């Protein structure tokens, strides 16, 4: 049974700084600087900040080309996600829900509630029809900082994740520092995700952040133990551009040629002779003789 649980508040923003870097593939590298192009959250981007405090932010958000998701809490309020299009009985949707012992991932035609939630029981959907995918494994989930990257490429729903303990700061913002996200699971689902929603469990305070990935070039530094410890966004500013070109996180004093300046066209100009008579192909092809 769906239960309708509010007002709408304007979003807050936080400073992403240097976060959202994940291992681009499953290949060991060490003591090397590697250049790769992939979907990454842009450095120093603007990230939307939602609150769960009597207010519980759980709006339907766009997925765009990939989502960076992060949350900070102690009470484990955020326990799952819904991904899909219309998010109703007309299409297949992906439901990812964690609990005390396991994680259940299934793709089915769910008729989702107007305001879905868990109540420790599922009050996420009223009904479901014929499923196409099922997967069960171990749970995905000072305060606990949990970060995820959700990508949907060629039918594969790729999840990267990292979990670290963080010290509590009064501003209650995103911490500085570099931490790379390791691959968690790769699900061969084959559905079109355009929207997603966060599932909260009721019975405390929590907050989460949402950013969007872009096609950018990064230089990744692998240390002795193949761990990524730093990265450069080659499309952030002129200094990073030079660093990427010279394959070094360090630039020596001097002048370097790194790019090219080119003015783009602004209008389409089409000029033809003014002719109103049409070519008599009909009188050639449809001839009697």
């Amino acid at each position, epitope marked *: 049974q769906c239960v309708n649980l509010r007002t709408q508040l304007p979003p807050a923003y936080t400073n992403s700084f240097t976060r959202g870097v994940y291992y681009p593939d499953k290949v060991f590298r060490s003591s090397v600087l590697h250049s790769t192009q992939d979907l990454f959250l842009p450095f120093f981007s*603007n990230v939307t900040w939602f609150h769960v405090i009597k207010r519980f932010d759980n709006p*339907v*958000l*766009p997925f*765009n080309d990939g989502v960076y998701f992060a949350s900070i809490e102690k009470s484990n309020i955020i326990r799952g996600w819904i991904f899909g299009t219309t998010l*109703d009985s007309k299409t297949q949707s992906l439901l990812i829900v964690n609990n005390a012992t396991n994680v259940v991932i299934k793709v089915c035609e769910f008729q989702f509630c107007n305001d879905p939630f868990l109540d420790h029981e599922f009050r996420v959907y009223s009904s479901a029809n014929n499923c196409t995918f099922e997967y069960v494994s171990q749970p995905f989930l000072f305060k606990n900082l949990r970060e995820f990257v959700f990508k949907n490429i060629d039918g594969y729903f790729k999840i990267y994740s990292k979990h670290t303990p963080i010290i509590v700061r009064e501003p209650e913002d995103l911490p500085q520092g570099f931490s790379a996200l390791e691959p968690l699971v790769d699900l061969p689902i084959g559905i079109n995700i355009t929207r997603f929603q966060t599932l909260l469990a009721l019975h405390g305070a929590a907050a989460y952040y*949402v950013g*969007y990935l872009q096609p950018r070039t990064f230089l990744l530094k692998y240390n002795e133990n193949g761990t990524i410890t730093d990265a450069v966004d080659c499309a952030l500013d002129p200094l990073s551009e030079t660093k990427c070109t010279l394959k070094s996180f360090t630039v020596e004093k001097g002048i370097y040629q790194t790019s090219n300046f080119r003015v783009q066209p*602004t209008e389409s100009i089409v000029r033809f002779p003014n002719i109103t008579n049409l070519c008599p192909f009909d009188e050639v092809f449809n001839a009697t003789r």
Partner: antibody
Amino acid sequence: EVQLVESGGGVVQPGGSLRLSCAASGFTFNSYGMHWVRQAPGKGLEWVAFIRYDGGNKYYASVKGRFTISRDNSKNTLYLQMKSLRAEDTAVYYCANLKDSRYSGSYYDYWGQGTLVTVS
Amino acid sequence: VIWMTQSPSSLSASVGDRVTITCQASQDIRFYLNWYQQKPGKAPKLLISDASNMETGVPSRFSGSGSGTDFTFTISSLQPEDIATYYCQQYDNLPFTFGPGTKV
């Protein structure tokens, strides 16, 4: 509250040009795609252009080759640059965020008030 | 380009009457149709999304259904506040298009 404010309207001559802008506030402008829609006196709603959230892909209607759509996510501002304006382009121009489960993914539908552009 | 049409272009009805508006697409657009209501001097308001889903805040007297090329918009009981021009819009593919508009 969510607002979309059009400006830059007015009267121009045929063959001339006009740049319109729409200031957005109250929502995460930089995560949504945006549309331009126009309506001339006596007629229905005509779709003009669409731009994706990252300012990357652009789509155009009757206006392709003359109108350019762009945005600046650091100012929350949507732009429409209209060149080679014709008498037929007289209309009230709206900026909008149209509910769309297939392309933009928007779950909410927002409209501005519209700005009048006259070509004569 | 998918062409949209509506019928009737204009209809006469009193308060308490049942009103139906037909929207037809030249191509199969499954269930990706929006219905808008526009009052004079105002921007269009969305009433129905994805063919049959009602928007929050929309009175229960409004409804709609259909799939493919033939869609229906219904007012179970016309109110004095329901006098407006109604449009259907497809978002199956770009460019997006609006119908001619039906005058109630």
